[PDB]
Design a protein around this motif. Structure first.
Motif, PDB file in Angstrom:
ATOM      1  N   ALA C   6       2.270 -47.671  -2.360  1.00  0.00           N
ATOM      2  CA  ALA C   6       3.059 -46.571  -1.821  1.00  0.00           C
ATOM      3  C   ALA C   6       3.937 -46.034  -2.923  1.00  0.00           C
ATOM      4  N   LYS C   7       3.995 -44.712  -3.058  1.00  0.00           N
ATOM      5  CA  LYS C   7       4.775 -44.103  -4.110  1.00  0.00           C
ATOM      6  C   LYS C   7       6.197 -43.734  -3.685  1.00  0.00           C
ATOM      7  N   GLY C   8       6.400 -43.345  -2.431  1.00  0.00           N
ATOM      8  CA  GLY C   8       7.726 -42.978  -1.981  1.00  0.00           C
ATOM      9  C   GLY C   8       8.302 -41.820  -2.742  1.00  0.00           C
ATOM     10  N   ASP C   9       7.500 -40.791  -2.957  1.00  0.00           N
ATOM     11  CA  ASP C   9       7.923 -39.614  -3.718  1.00  0.00           C
ATOM     12  C   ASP C   9       7.963 -38.379  -2.838  1.00  0.00           C
ATOM     13  N   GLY C  10       7.719 -38.497  -1.536  1.00  0.00           N
ATOM     14  CA  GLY C  10       7.749 -37.383  -0.617  1.00  0.00           C
ATOM     15  C   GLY C  10       6.573 -36.461  -0.731  1.00  0.00           C
ATOM     16  N   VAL C  11       5.568 -36.764  -1.519  1.00  0.00           N
ATOM     17  CA  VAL C  11       4.468 -35.843  -1.759  1.00  0.00           C
ATOM     18  C   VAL C  11       3.139 -36.557  -1.647  1.00  0.00           C
ATOM     19  N   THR C  12       2.948 -37.659  -2.386  1.00  0.00           N
ATOM     20  CA  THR C  12       1.767 -38.472  -2.244  1.00  0.00           C
ATOM     21  C   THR C  12       1.639 -38.889  -0.777  1.00  0.00           C
ATOM     22  N   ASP C  13       0.431 -38.838  -0.266  1.00  0.00           N
ATOM     23  CA  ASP C  13       0.168 -39.318   1.089  1.00  0.00           C
ATOM     24  C   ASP C  13       0.155 -40.839   1.064  1.00  0.00           C
ATOM     25  N   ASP C  14       1.258 -41.449   1.531  1.00  0.00           N
ATOM     26  CA  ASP C  14       1.418 -42.897   1.517  1.00  0.00           C
ATOM     27  C   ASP C  14       0.869 -43.556   2.787  1.00  0.00           C
ATOM     28  N   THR C  15       0.164 -42.838   3.631  1.00  0.00           N
ATOM     29  CA  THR C  15      -0.294 -43.406   4.902  1.00  0.00           C
ATOM     30  C   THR C  15      -1.122 -44.653   4.678  1.00  0.00           C
ATOM     31  N   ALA C  16      -2.120 -44.593   3.790  1.00  0.00           N
ATOM     32  CA  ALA C  16      -3.026 -45.730   3.644  1.00  0.00           C
ATOM     33  C   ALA C  16      -2.270 -46.931   3.116  1.00  0.00           C
ATOM     34  N   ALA C  17      -1.412 -46.751   2.136  1.00  0.00           N
ATOM     35  CA  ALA C  17      -0.703 -47.901   1.567  1.00  0.00           C
ATOM     36  C   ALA C  17       0.244 -48.508   2.569  1.00  0.00           C
ATOM     37  N   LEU C  18       0.916 -47.697   3.377  1.00  0.00           N
ATOM     38  CA  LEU C  18       1.807 -48.254   4.411  1.00  0.00           C
ATOM     39  C   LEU C  18       1.021 -48.960   5.475  1.00  0.00           C
ATOM     40  N   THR C  19      -0.121 -48.424   5.921  1.00  0.00           N
ATOM     41  CA  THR C  19      -0.941 -49.114   6.888  1.00  0.00           C
ATOM     42  C   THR C  19      -1.370 -50.472   6.355  1.00  0.00           C
ATOM     43  N   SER C  20      -1.804 -50.541   5.102  1.00  0.00           N
ATOM     44  CA  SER C  20      -2.216 -51.831   4.562  1.00  0.00           C
ATOM     45  C   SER C  20      -1.036 -52.764   4.450  1.00  0.00           C
ATOM     46  N   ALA C  21       0.156 -52.294   4.054  1.00  0.00           N
ATOM     47  CA  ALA C  21       1.309 -53.192   4.026  1.00  0.00           C
ATOM     48  C   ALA C  21       1.618 -53.716   5.429  1.00  0.00           C
ATOM     49  N   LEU C  22       1.616 -52.851   6.436  1.00  0.00           N
ATOM     50  CA  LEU C  22       1.856 -53.312   7.803  1.00  0.00           C
ATOM     51  C   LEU C  22       0.839 -54.340   8.221  1.00  0.00           C
ATOM     52  N   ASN C  23      -0.421 -54.103   7.943  1.00  0.00           N
ATOM     53  CA  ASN C  23      -1.475 -55.046   8.363  1.00  0.00           C
ATOM     54  C   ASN C  23      -1.336 -56.377   7.683  1.00  0.00           C
ATOM     55  N   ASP C  24      -0.813 -56.381   6.453  1.00  0.00           N
ATOM     56  CA  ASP C  24      -0.798 -57.603   5.654  1.00  0.00           C
ATOM     57  C   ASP C  24       0.532 -58.336   5.742  1.00  0.00           C
ATOM     58  N   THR C  25       1.499 -57.841   6.495  1.00  0.00           N
ATOM     59  CA  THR C  25       2.863 -58.377   6.530  1.00  0.00           C
ATOM     60  C   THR C  25       3.164 -58.939   7.919  1.00  0.00           C
ATOM     61  N   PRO C  26       3.830 -60.056   8.107  1.00  0.00           N
ATOM     62  CA  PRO C  26       4.198 -60.508   9.451  1.00  0.00           C
ATOM     63  C   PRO C  26       5.024 -59.474  10.166  1.00  0.00           C
ATOM     64  N   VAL C  27       4.862 -59.386  11.523  1.00  0.00           N
ATOM     65  CA  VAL C  27       5.553 -58.332  12.289  1.00  0.00           C
ATOM     66  C   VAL C  27       7.068 -58.450  12.242  1.00  0.00           C
ATOM     67  N   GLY C  28       7.595 -59.677  11.984  1.00  0.00           N
ATOM     68  CA  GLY C  28       9.041 -59.832  11.996  1.00  0.00           C
ATOM     69  C   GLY C  28       9.682 -59.519  10.632  1.00  0.00           C
ATOM     70  N   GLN C  29       8.908 -59.308   9.592  1.00  0.00           N
ATOM     71  CA  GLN C  29       9.458 -58.948   8.286  1.00  0.00           C
ATOM     72  C   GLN C  29      10.040 -57.510   8.355  1.00  0.00           C
ATOM     73  N   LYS C  30      11.232 -57.344   7.815  1.00  0.00           N
ATOM     74  CA  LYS C  30      11.836 -56.013   7.663  1.00  0.00           C
ATOM     75  C   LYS C  30      11.344 -55.446   6.347  1.00  0.00           C
ATOM     76  N   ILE C  31      10.498 -54.411   6.380  1.00  0.00           N
ATOM     77  CA  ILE C  31       9.938 -53.848   5.154  1.00  0.00           C
ATOM     78  C   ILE C  31      10.927 -52.848   4.586  1.00  0.00           C
ATOM     79  N   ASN C  32      11.445 -53.129   3.386  1.00  0.00           N
ATOM     80  CA  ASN C  32      12.508 -52.312   2.785  1.00  0.00           C
ATOM     81  C   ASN C  32      11.864 -51.179   2.006  1.00  0.00           C
TER      82      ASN C  32
END
Ligand SMILES: CC(=O)N[C@H]1[C@H]([C@H](O)[C@H](O)CO)O[C@](O)(C(=O)O)C[C@@H]1O
Ligand SMILES: [Cl-]
Ligand SMILES: [Cl-]
Ligand SMILES: [Cl-]
Ligand SMILES: [Cl-]
Ligand SMILES: [Cl-]
Ligand SMILES: [Cl-]
Ligand SMILES: [Cl-]
Ligand SMILES: [Cl-]
Ligand SMILES: [Cl-]
Ligand SMILES: [Cl-]
Ligand SMILES: [Cl-]
Ligand SMILES: [Cl-]
Ligand SMILES: [Cl-]
Ligand SMILES: [Cl-]
Ligand SMILES: [Cl-]
Ligand code: NA
Ligand code: NA
Lengths: 670, 670, 670
Positions: C6-32
């Motif tokens: 995920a780039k977090g630059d407001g322009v790159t489409d970060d959808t795929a990277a965020l979906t993969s982070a969500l899928n790979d992270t426990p639900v109780g983790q606070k993703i900063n």
């Protein structure tokens, strides 16, 4: 000497590594367990962890799981706070048109004394809850019998409930009745209203309306003369069409095709339909509700007073036309011993049923599924004699998600003795069971919240709850106590709720996320004055003002009272007295009994210069039982002025002579 | 040019590094201080840190410490919200059988006007609190004097309190009395009840019962005839045995050995024992309570009205047999100047005492320990003239944990001037002192919460609190204000609580973890309608219904009133009037004074066709002071019909003749 | 195949990277999200992120921004919870002497039926709020017209409000009046009071007092004889000096120079000054308030009923001397179409004005600034047709910080259709606009909270709020609904608030940090019984006791009633009846109509042995309309005993003879 780190694999004993991390870490650090499960020999300081699960065998051979904060996305709410014994949501909760309903029974004990079937509701996805509503009155034959209910839900826009009658003395079932009522709705419709010329009825097309003759309907903007305002259903044509009687008739047919209008229904302004089912044989309790389709539903039941137990359901295939027609379907006989209070739900053609186990030393809760509404079953037994709890549940994807609560601390496990008559902190659990795998051997009960069991009496209001899903959240509504004794053993053996702290059981709701929340948070901190139950406004003169109608049924003591103008265009102040008769009387004064009296006055002050007066003197007055009538005229209208008895009392006396008597004829002396 | 990072060593000036971290970090990031202490020259944006402590010398030479969120595991609660001036938990709090008690005084000012000694309680380890209870009534000689209390606690299952009488005019002490009462308990016992044949008394074995003759006892399941229900103590044999009088006698001895039964005691149904101690000489206030053993306790005191001050304790070695016998023990003379209101507690044979300092410019609070219940002491002075606060405390392991609050912002430090008559945010602190090291030179006061001081009057309700431990948590119950002025300088110089926002002082509780919590969280968000103080239920007809008895003592204005059937098997509606006499009268109408009257009717409407009527006309009516009596019979029972005066009024008149008079004899004309 | 993070630059489409982070992270983790903005194609599970902002084009071409928890330091509070339709803080909020005021209108609908202009207040920086206060009564000509207010604020220590009169039928404006009142204050002053010898007036020096003749002033410690207690302003000399009339005079001049004393003012004890402005031409609504200086202020307005619209302000340059004098200033004509309800504030010589847009398909909200109090302007248009919301705002540093709310979900965007008659979750936004850059093309609306729109009626109470700054926090007070239908289409077309759940709209406050907080937290969890609205105390006898005066205006049903001693040194119990007349009557009994009657008694019981009685029998009694008078004396004082009619009724009868008549003369027979 090398040291090991915590493995978080559910098998390695991580006790030593966690103890060393705790010792070496500041107390305010949130230690992140990374979503892993850590095996321990006793629970560490759980408060210092986030995103951690522990597995621990309090009883060897019986692993249970324990959640730190944030391991699950979930939160506990307290949802009632009333002096009644508020318990037994089992198994009545439901969601209808965006509102979450938590029905329960508020009584004074495990029994039907002082009981009202009640609910609270949430209009904000569980953040806040409403003022309790009584759904039942005390039975007409109270205090011999009273109502009870553990089965309620919705089918085709009507609430249905199994309203039982039970004895106060023994909580014995004496009658079962199906009660049902239309739910309140606002409908925003286009077309559907026709009114034939030269008659007074209109036909209303509302698919699946669920209304009966006599039910309330309100109309706005119908564009059909006479179909307006508060009305009632005159006839039901079919499940999609009904008629109303209008006050008038037109010489042309009317039809609001293409026009937008509004209809409202009302739970409160429609009567219950009550169908007496008698004392259904071989039933102890009716419990839980599964909507099947647009026509009917199932209700769970058990028989547990005499051997052999039964556990099963009653299926009402067409509760609309035939509310008295149902069929009894039992679970397999091997699963009926030591079992009660089944929870039932229906999803995608499958009826699921989960029992309560009655004993920690015999096989306990079991789970059953059927594709023929309980004629045949597949079954499994949960390990370790799950007991004393119902297991309400919902299906979310491939999982059943079920909740249970021990009733007092350390009762959950197989072989654990009951733990009553002392305060403790009972554990509440949830678990997931994958319906494809259909095997509970590996089930993981996760302790997500702890309650209080007060200990002043043997019984517990903890648990015995109900579950619903709304959107992406699951809700477990259930009881919990506090440390305030009811003083049954004490100064309140009568169990009066309104003495001291009343009864400690109240309802809670665990709100757990079970799928994505794709919106910014709706959460708020509640900082308002709660102003629904007794709505108060400081008036422009600085005085607290309650504009709502209210009933005070308990004994009231009042100070100075002013009865304001209120009635007939505010011309008068008014007090009306009910009963066979009214009584207005005067206590015996504590300090000056010799003054006992009431002064009634047509003016503003105790001086008779302000108005006519009648003063009734008490027996304790020095002038015992005197009456003084003091006006500038004494006018006796409509009847003779007579003594009560004949030839016993006089007009006047020797020191109280009338000046004369003005008569139209001489006295009649006999 | 190299830059330094923050060191977190309490000595390096970390201001620049923290400022750069704040500037370079997004505002929503929680900056973790890793449990370290950072020296700064002024406090940074504390809200952006977690797990951080700051050390800062607001006054050079006087370091104090400041906690970010999560540095301590702790939380502030608001626990009262009433219009009274609610302050002074000092030093009365206690825990008894799982309930946390926060006693206080609710008044209208720093004084005993409108004062009730009160408490609130928590049944859930401090999450929620009860409706206030008044423990004292207004004194019988109010408004000259009223009660006051700063010392209360429990010894052998009885509440003991030093109930002072003080003048309203000057808050001068006029009397001290020891009041005590049994605490409510439920006991689940086996055996212990004997009843000798052919007599009526039963002996009850309850170790350390703490009951006196006349105290309430309730029995259930005793298995001893006549030992049942609500009873009272007839005799006390010894501290472990008492007797009750039963209604009957048997020809065989009875003994419930081996049988399980239940006993209850009651605070509410037992009278106070009141022991008058007179005006104890050289006492200004009695304050704080230390249970010593199964027989007695100590209470702190000071004398501060005239020189020389005293500070010390009164020890009651046997408060059960000898409540009037106590011994005075002072702290060393060097520590008595500028000192008041000692807090005392007893642990493992050691009596600890901490004083309040009265002045920021003279030596302040000091700490003392004794192994002979105050005959000899070891002592230390806290640095920097701690003043204006009591320092309630508990011992946890080797530490005293003490709490204090400045009364207005920026008063804590030595030499700081009082800061009154403007709103501010006073700091609340805690500190730990290791009793083995016995040296306060290095003490670290940690600011854990800030309160509000309103500023509308010079006095402050902030602070002056009380401390208890329950389980693994310590609780500091103390006052705090809000920004709502009481309008003493304004429209409420009379200090009426029930005008506008009343008085701003209310109680708070800081709940701090002090050892491991080995259970899953019990925490909840409160989402219920508070339904204890005025319990409301929507009845089946949709009307708010309050079933509890209630007293309304303030002036009431009512609208339309219906008095429902309530009395003698609900045959009648009933109103009873107290006082020497009752008065029911009629205001002067605002719009049509000429109509002033009350119509009393035996039926439902203003038309006389509905029932007999008597109408009392007001003096302002056109028919001034008329009475019209309108029935179809007028029957005068039990007495002659007489004029009040002799030979002044008539029967009839020339335009109001009676047709005749029916008499049993001719008139007696004289 | 490489994957991108995920780039977090407001322009790159970060959808795929965020979906993969969500899928790979426990639900109780606070993703900063590290304070970055992530472009997505639909919103992910926002609940799993902290410190993250999303940018998303729900409508292509219209990016909006969405905050996870902690991205902003802010929180939502619920601040009212009453059955009225509580909405429209627009645009009335203000802060005065440390208290935050949230004025609003509580009605039964979008209209002036049942309406009171109201407020709630916070004394603790927004954590908790007060019981609602009614600022207006129903208009004297209700139900034809009633009050309304959208403009209120403070100038020189007085509250000023534009109190409109509008029709119930159409919400049409019929009158504008400026109402003003002094605010309550306590002043702690030194010197300033003089009293010349041999006369009775004293001169009081209070800079900028803002008082008028007749306003309330209270004095304490003045050290000037006769200047004491509750007084009123006799004259105003100038803006800094007034006089009072004292009761006495001295032979020496008095002057409290150098002496400290206290003054209080009172909103409640001072009358409104009411200045009738008539039906101001070309006005639909007056809305928003900008204090200009020590003499006056501006109020916003629009005209929108007929073409052409106007939008602008009324400036009152000297509201103290000349409340009827104002000047109308319009915004530029290009910005008046499709515009209403301007918000105005004044900072550093610049008047800022922001409009509401009325249509999503035409140019919407615009922003204007003026350095000559609206004679000339600079202007800009917000992109994308911002509509249906006011945009209240404050200036903090170089930014305007503005808040708005869509009224129902998915209405915010240009071209979006209204979304009514179904429940939804409307978005609330804020934005910053740098006044130096003066360009909104790039504006970023950030969704910080979501509300509920109930859907039972077309109108919405969501939004239309008001903004204030206090210290380092900004506060947006605004409406929101819940899921509880008002049943307008249903059983409550009359819109009675006191039926079922009343109206769903209530107020909320979003509290957002906008600068450093250099103190330890003041935050608490509220755990108290709310005890301000109906203050309850358990008395020493265990009964709930309310000591506050109260008014119950709704219909009341009472059970057993005791009227306690209350009046004239507590000698008597008292009931007073208002109106032209009072009526005390007796319902028709349901079970035994034959017994209908009221027994009035001078003693304690229904037996006549306890006291004199009069019993009025109902028409339904077997003894229809009987009266029985039962005393041991019947004494007729002050008047003759007469029949009502002449020569129609008798004394006695043949079966009810008087024994004799005692007369001072023979009967007068005619
Ligand atoms: C409730 C009621 O009607 N009480 C009445 C009683 C009963 O009628 C009587 O006790 C029945 O036995 O009689 C009186 O005392 C009486 O005759 O003097 C009047 C009193 O009002
Ligand atoms: Cl329960
Ligand atoms: Cl069952
Ligand atoms: Cl069981
Ligand atoms: Cl079970
Ligand atoms: Cl009335
Ligand atoms: Cl305090
Ligand atoms: Cl003291
Ligand atoms: Cl002091
Ligand atoms: Cl001190
Ligand atoms: Cl009654
Ligand atoms: Cl609003
Ligand atoms: Cl406007
Ligand atoms: Cl609009
Ligand atoms: Cl807009
Ligand atoms: Cl009274
Ligand atoms: Na208070
Ligand atoms: Na509302």
């Amino acid at each position: 000497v090398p040291r090991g780190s915590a493995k978080g694999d559910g098998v390695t004993d991580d006790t030593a590594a966690l103890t060393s991390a705790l010792n070496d870490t500041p107390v305010g650090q949130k230690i992140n367990g990374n979503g892993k499960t850590y095996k321990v020999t006793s629970l560490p300081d759980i408060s210092r962890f986030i995103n951690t699960r522990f597995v621990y065998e309090r009883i060897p051979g019986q692993p249970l799981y324990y959640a730190s904060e944030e391991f699950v996305q979930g939160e506990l709410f307290k949802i009632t706070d009333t002096p009644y014994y508020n318990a037994w949501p089992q198994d009545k909760a439901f969601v209808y048109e965006n509102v979450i309903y938590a029905p329960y029974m508020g009584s004074d004990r495990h029994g039907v004394s002082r009981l009202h079937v009640s609910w609270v509701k949430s209009g904000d996805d569980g953040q806040t809850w409403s003022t309790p509503e009584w759904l039942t009155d005390l039975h007409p034959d109270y205090p011999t019998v009273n109502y009870h209910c553990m089965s309620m839900g919705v089918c085709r826009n009507r609430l249905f409930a199994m309203i039982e009658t039970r004895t106060l003395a023994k909580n014995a079932l004496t009658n079962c009745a199906l009660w049902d009522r239309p739910m309140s709705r606002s409908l925003h419709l286009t077309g559907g209203i026709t009114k034939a010329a030269n008659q007074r009825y209109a036909t209303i097309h509302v698919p699946d309306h669920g209304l009966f003759v006599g039910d309330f309907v309100n109309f706005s903007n119908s564009a059909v003369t006479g179909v307006s305002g508060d009305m009632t259903v005159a006839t039901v044509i079919d499940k999609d069409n009904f008629t109303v009687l209008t006050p008038n008739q037109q010489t042309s047919d009317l039809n609001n095709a293409g026009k937008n209008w509004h209809m409202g229904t009302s739970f409160h302004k429609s009567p219950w339909r009550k169908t007496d089912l008698g004392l259904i044989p071989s039933v102890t309790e009716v419990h839980s509700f599964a909507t099947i389709d647009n026509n009917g539903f199932a209700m769970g039941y058990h028989q547990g007073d005499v051997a052999p137990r039964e556990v099963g359901l009653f299926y009402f295939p067409d509760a609309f036309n035939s509310p008295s027609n149902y069929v009894r379907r039992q679970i397999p006989s091997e699963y009926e011993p030591d079992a009660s209070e089944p929870c039932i739900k229906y999803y995608d053609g499958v009826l699921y049923l989960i029992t309560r186990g009655t004993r920690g030393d015999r096989l306990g809760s079991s789970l059953h599924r059927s594709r023929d509404i309980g004629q045949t079953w597949e079954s499994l037994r949960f390990p370790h004699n799950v007991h004393h709890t119902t297991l309400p549940f919902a299906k979310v994807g491939d999982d059943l998600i079920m909740f249970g609560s021990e009733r007092a601390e350390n009762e959950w496990e197989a072989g654990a003795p009951d733990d009553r008559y002392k305060a403790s902190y009972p554990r509440t659990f949830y678990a997931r069971l994958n319906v494809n795998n259909w095997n509970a051997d590996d089930i993981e009960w996760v302790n997500i919240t702890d309650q209080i069991y007060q200990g002043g009496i043997v019984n517990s209001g903890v648990g015995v709850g109900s579950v619903v899903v709304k959107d992406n959240y699951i809700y477990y509504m259930f009881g919990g106590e506090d440390h305030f004794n009811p003083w049954t053993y004490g100064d309140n053996s009568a169990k009066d709720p309104f003495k001291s702290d009343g009864h400690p059981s109240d309802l809670y709701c665990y709100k757990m996320k079970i799928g994505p929340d794709n919106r910014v948070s709706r959460d708020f901190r509640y900082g308002a004055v709660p102003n629904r139950a007794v709505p108060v406004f400081f008036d422009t003169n600085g005085v607290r003002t309650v504009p709502a109608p209210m009933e005070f049924t308990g004994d009231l003591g009042l100070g100075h009272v002013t009865i304001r103008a209120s009635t007939s265009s505010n011309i008068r102040s008014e007090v009306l007295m009910e009963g066979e008769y009214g009584f207005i009387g005067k206590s015996i004064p504590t300090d000056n009994p010799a003054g006992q009296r009431i002064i009634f006055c047509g003016g503003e002050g105790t001086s008779s210069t302000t108005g006519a007066q009648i003063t009734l003197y008490g027996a304790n007055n020095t002038d015992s039982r005197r009456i003084v009538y003091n006006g500038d005229e004494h006018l006796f209208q409509s009847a003779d002025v007579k003594p009560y008895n004949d030839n016993v009392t006089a007009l006047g006396g020797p020191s109280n002579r009338f000046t004369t008597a003005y008569l139209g004829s001489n006295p009649i002396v006999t």
